[PDB]
Design a protein around this motif. Sequence first.
Motif, PDB file in Angstrom:
ATOM      1  N   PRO A 100       0.820  -1.219   0.000  1.00 29.99           N
ATOM      2  CA  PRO A 100       0.000   0.000   0.000  1.00 29.99           C
ATOM      3  C   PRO A 100       0.836   1.243   0.000  1.00 29.99           C
ATOM      4  CG  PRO A 100      -0.878  -1.585   1.553  1.00 29.99           C
ATOM      5  CD  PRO A 100       0.518  -2.070   1.159  1.00 29.99           C
ATOM      6  N   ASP A 123      -0.676   4.447   0.949  1.00 33.95           N
ATOM      7  CA  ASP A 123      -1.415   5.434   1.722  1.00 33.95           C
ATOM      8  C   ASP A 123      -0.471   5.935   2.790  1.00 33.95           C
ATOM      9  OD1 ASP A 123      -1.873   2.562   2.822  1.00 33.95           O
ATOM     10  OD2 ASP A 123      -2.236   3.849   4.594  1.00 33.95           O
ATOM     11  N   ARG A 132      -1.147  -0.818  -8.197  1.00 36.96           N
ATOM     12  CA  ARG A 132      -2.189  -0.797  -7.209  1.00 36.96           C
ATOM     13  C   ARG A 132      -3.109   0.418  -7.595  1.00 36.96           C
ATOM     14  NH1 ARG A 132      -3.026  -2.827  -1.874  1.00 36.96           N
ATOM     15  NH2 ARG A 132      -4.163  -1.311  -0.609  1.00 36.96           N
ATOM     16  N   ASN A 133      -4.398   0.336  -7.356  1.00 37.85           N
ATOM     17  CA  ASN A 133      -5.294   1.486  -7.597  1.00 37.85           C
ATOM     18  C   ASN A 133      -5.161   1.956  -9.087  1.00 37.85           C
ATOM     19  OD1 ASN A 133      -5.644   1.761  -4.681  1.00 37.85           O
ATOM     20  ND2 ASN A 133      -3.770   2.938  -4.563  1.00 37.85           N
TER      21      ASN A 133
HETATM   22 CL    CL Z   1      -3.028   2.249  -1.151  1.00 40.51          CL
END
Ligand code: CL
Length: 193
Positions: free
Chosen positions: A73, A75, A107-108
Amino acid sequence: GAGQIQVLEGLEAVRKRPGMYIGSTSERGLHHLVWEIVDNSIDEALAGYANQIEVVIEKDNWIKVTDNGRGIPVDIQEKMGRPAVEVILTSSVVNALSQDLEVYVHRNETIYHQAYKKGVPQFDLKEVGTTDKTGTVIRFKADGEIFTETTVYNYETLQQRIRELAFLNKGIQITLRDERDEENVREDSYHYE
Ligand SMILES: [Cl-]
Ligand SMILES: CCCn1c(=O)ccc2c(-c3cnc(-c4cccnc4)s3)n[nH]c21
Ligand SMILES: [Mg+2]
Ligand SMILES: [Mg+2]
Ligand SMILES: [Mg+2]
Ligand SMILES: [Mg+2]
């Protein structure tokens, strides 16, 4: 603040006594680098997400490990103020013991990239492209200041352990490829039931 300082100290600690962390700085510890990263990909498979792992020995003994898991991730991580992938990779023994390390996260629907030297990020995590896949790519070059005897991998060593890991972790496809000599490329791919 404090969290980031913790990071730097941790890098210093690892590079000062690398054998305490990976067993040795001989040929055995060199190959342990690969095991540490491949074990992280295996954990993402066991969690239910990944099913394919590829290990490539690249020219000048770079290693590239690729999995099709969720992607590490990106974030902003609450205790560091930094992207989660940056926290995970600046706490990695492989990164600390590599002269250079690159990550690419899918990702995303986005491809994110960061690079490091001896664990230190060279730039903030960046968006570099788009994707319709998920997964993570790590490429690293073992630090010859740590691995003073050799930084040359042994295909057979890699092959025997990869084959074992696929046998033990049934369902995961694990592929080894040697691209060091572009005129003669060798690949083995393992996939048990
Ligand atoms: Cl993320
Ligand atoms: C070749 C890269 C190998 N590799 C590593 O070295 C380190 C971490 C991971 C992960 C994830 C960890 N945490 C995830 C996560 C957790 C929750 C939600 N989404 C992803 S993915 N995948 N692959 C990895
Ligand atoms: Mg580990
Ligand atoms: Mg691990
Ligand atoms: Mg784990
Ligand atoms: Mg840009």
